[PDB]
Design a protein around this ligand. Structure first.
Ligand code: UPG
Ligand code: UPG
Ligand code: UPG
Ligand code: UPG
Lengths: 289, 289, 289, 289
């Protein structure tokens, strides 16, 4: 029993993306060749996670369910739940309390795109840590926007601040977290912040003080993207297009990852790629086996 | 009589774009900072057309209606009608027969993106043509994919073929057409081709055989874009992003066009810019007035 | 142009019914007062379908042709084609590609018996849906045997599995399907399943993901029969006998349905019932007019 | 001499069963778990008869041959001969004259189903009778339909009439008869009746007038079934289904009878049970040995 359950928090309205998000849900927007939701979903599968709860707005939840179903086609077990109002990342564990039960869990933001040659290994370690938590961070130019993590002369994380007026560093904690079961009771005791939200940073600070928090780095060989603005969104799509078209590889293709993790076998892949063989998406899969 | 009516055919399922078009209508996909449907709408607007019929599938028509409404916000009159199945472009005149009536009509595909400094002047002539039809052709590398038009030494159109295995030229007829009322009766008497579709090319050939076909060239300063594949889709988005960011202008922005053409006043622009004031899209509108 | 064409897949060997099927084709076995084939045939006529292709084994195909002919006696247009080997339900659209052409179609299993006071209405809706598909489902005690459809807390179908080891529900998709023209291209891209067959469920899952699939229920007032075993077969016959003998009505009598749907007139019915007036079969018809 | 020869008359067209008998021979229709022909075959088998002639129409004879073959699989010797037209039951002796030769013969209708615990003992006496004939009578409600036999106070048969408008009793003579060699010459000298048929009743009356007619009662524990109509057909099937399912026994199963009577051994039973091992029919055979 380890981090066998995951949650994808895909709520919000994406107002900064208007008018593109007036007709399409942000997490359904394409990132080159696939819907945005495929990326965070692929991140959890890479960690060996099959039981995944997707939390979204009452309007967008059914659209994700139509696209993905129960995930059985990829050897997954997808569930869904609505978030009435975006009260904060931490509320994910409140809404997913029954789903999580007594197991470990992982949380990823539905609009964060992760990629890196060593990503699988990086998360393998996070999954094998049954007590405590693991967060990920990387350098940015606008730390005041995200949760910040400060290290010491050695290289240990000693502080965390949610959007500090004067950041202690430029290392922001990304939207990917791995917790043990104690995270549920933590979120239930949290109180609203200055902005009236249950902060994920308040939970991570506790694991830190207990000395049970790992802070893995997503630097040097990792992709650092943002889907928040029209400009950042297209940059993200260009990144994916560039690596897929120039290096001949697929990034966050759930059918491929499901095969690699042995969620589905070769026969199943061919069955899935059959109907999709009209474009290179299905052809790549047919070549894979 | 000036052409004051237009039809935007935004149906289909865009299989070549799977899986992005699985839970999202192709014509709703973003093209950098706005949904695809905005582009062809703008084209008709630049032609002075304000009475527009939008045809889509029974599943997608309601989504466009939810996005564009009646178009009154832009001083437009938008109507909707469903196309049961993709039986051909020409079927838009049979579906929109009641819409058209006795007036001339324009047809533009919902996934075609037109941009050019002289685009308005180019269509101004087509809109003012008394009797006959006007199409546009431009050079491409894969003519076999589109409707092909061949010219004679004099420079007159003498041959029209749909996806010829042996193209008699490299000039493709794009998805923008201006017809007089006689098109309706033409479409009604059309018989499906091998693929069982009411071919627009058959219509154009009829106008040509009658010697009433005008073919305006859309070369030089005109954008030649395609939204058929993931690769060409991102190229289109990059085109728009590049022009807007480096030349400080908006391509096919309904609010700006409606203003520049006086369809709406300055007070209204501010109202529309409000919900979009979080990004450069809305701010551009505020700065405009 | 709607679902005007139908296919009856009546192949197989019915080995589980041996030795009864050693001398008689399964679809010719009597279900009380009429041959089994009359039921699925009557289901398509009730949907207003007149152009019907019957697919069967090279041995049994000519026997159906002898019994039914070209169906002109009932205002139908029956065609026949042989299926060399039972490669799967989906192969029906491959074998019937020329027959289907560019029209919509419906597929029914030759050994499924449907009945219900509201059946006509239920299918009327399915026939009027030109884009997408409609499948039917009902509760069972052995879901692992059929295609399973899972719904959500609301009441929408969100998943489909062909004989799941651990069914998500007890709602099996019966042998009755209505598709648009896109079903042909779908079946041609399908790949064999674990059992080496082209699954109808693989096609239905695609319509589901596209949000173009309707899942009508054949519950409460509908008959739920099975012709697979000696025990189920006689139960099915007893059901028909019971309703016909105790409620004085005919179930799936093609001459009656042909009259009700106006395929044939009163004079034609009398002409047909004349020679059959030796038993109550022809007498009922003579009384009907 | 014991009667070691039998004739099964399985011709006709069964018009009363239309339309089930249109493309299917009446004697091939299933009676729950086996074709009708199996029942009368079993009756002769229980009487020790192994040399059997099966007479049917020119169109159906080949279908029975395809089903039963030569009967060697059951240690039987089966032969086939066609009956051009339905000129009467007595014509079976004229057609089978060469088959019969100088031996006694038994005649059973192909659509008559006999079952009774004491049935074997009942026929054992008839088979061992030296000279004369033996018929069977039982009570019915519509004697006018069958051959009627009246008894005197002493209990002796004194009157035989075919379908009497005014039956002198309610005892019908069933379709099972045991005759000595003199029947052949009797049949040959028979003159057709009003309906132009060689009446079996005329034959039986001849044996009666000579004082050589034995009439065994087939009442009490004997099944009285009729396959003439859809209603009585399903009642027969229900009878068999009920006895087999509730009393765990098979009615008229050739494989079991051939075994119980040692016509075939246990090794052979297994061979025959193989192709039937998918249902309770074959499994019953395997469990038997
Ligand atoms: O209750 C909520 C809150 C957020 N979201 C969505 O989750 C994503 C989060 O983006 P955002 O609101 O801008 O993140 P912040 O809340 O500002 O900050 C959190 O997410 C950052 C990563 O973007 C971390 O660096 C911070 O430490 C963490 O506290 C978006 O798509 C939101 O719409 C929900 O669905 N429900
Ligand atoms: O009945 C129909 C047919 C098409 N479309 C839509 O129209 C666009 C056209 O795409 P597609 O059907 O694949 O193009 P073709 O029909 O193969 O070709 C037509 O469009 C080309 C430009 O793209 C022209 O060059 C050709 O001459 C013209 O016949 C798409 O967004 C379709 O979904 C509909 O909505 N309904
Ligand atoms: O290539 C084929 C396959 C089947 N059949 C016949 O069609 C009927 C289908 O019965 P069966 O083989 O047992 O159905 P399955 O293939 O096990 O499953 C299909 O039929 C079920 C209804 O019985 C559905 O619930 C499932 O979703 C669907 O995939 C039978 O009379 C078959 O002989 C053919 O004629 N040709
Ligand atoms: O030339 C003939 C006559 C009959 N049959 C078959 O024999 C069975 C008898 O049916 P049917 O002809 O309708 O019965 P009847 O000839 O009217 O009556 C006969 O069979 C009855 C039992 O069913 C007896 O009671 C009567 O005395 C006897 O005359 C059927 O399966 C017939 O197809 C033949 O194959 N060939």
């Amino acid at each position: 029993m380890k981090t066998r359950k995951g949650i994808i928090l895909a709520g919000g309205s994406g107002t900064r993306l208007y008018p593109v998000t007036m007709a399409v849900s942000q997490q359904l927007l394409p990132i080159y060749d696939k819907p945005m939701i495929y990326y965070p979903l692929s991140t959890l599968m890479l960690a060996g996670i099959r039981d995944i709860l997707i939390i979204s707005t009452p309007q967008d939840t059914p659209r994700f369910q139509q696209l993905l179903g129960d995930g059985s086609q990829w050897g997954l077990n997808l569930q869904y739940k609505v978030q009435p109002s975006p009260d904060g990342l931490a509320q994910a564990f409140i809404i997913g309390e029954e789903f999580i039960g007594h197991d470990d869990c992982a949380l990823v933001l539905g609009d964060n795109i992760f990629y890196g040659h060593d990503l699988p290994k990086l998360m393998e370690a996070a999954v094998n840590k049954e007590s405590g938590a693991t967060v990920f961070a990387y350098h940015v130019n606008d730390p005041e926007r995200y949760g910040v993590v400060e290290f010491d002369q050695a290289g240990t994380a000693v502080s965390l601040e949610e959007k500090p007026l004067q950041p202690k560093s430029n290392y922001a904690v990304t939207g990917l977290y791995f917790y043990d079961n104690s995270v549920v009771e933590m979120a239930k005791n949290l109180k609203p912040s200055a902005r009236g939200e249950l902060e994920i940073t308040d939970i991570n600070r506790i694991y830190m003080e207990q000395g049970r928090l790992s802070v893995a780095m997503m630097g040097r060989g990792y992709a650092h993207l943002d889907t928040g603005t029209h400009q950042s969104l297209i940059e993200a799509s260009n990144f994916i297009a560039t690596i897929e078209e120039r290096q001949g590889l697929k990034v966050s293709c759930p059918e491929e990852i499901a095969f690699r993790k042995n969620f589905i076998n070769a026969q199943q892949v061919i069955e899935l790629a059959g109907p999709l063989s009209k474009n290179d998406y299905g052809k790549y899969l047919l070549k894979m086996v």
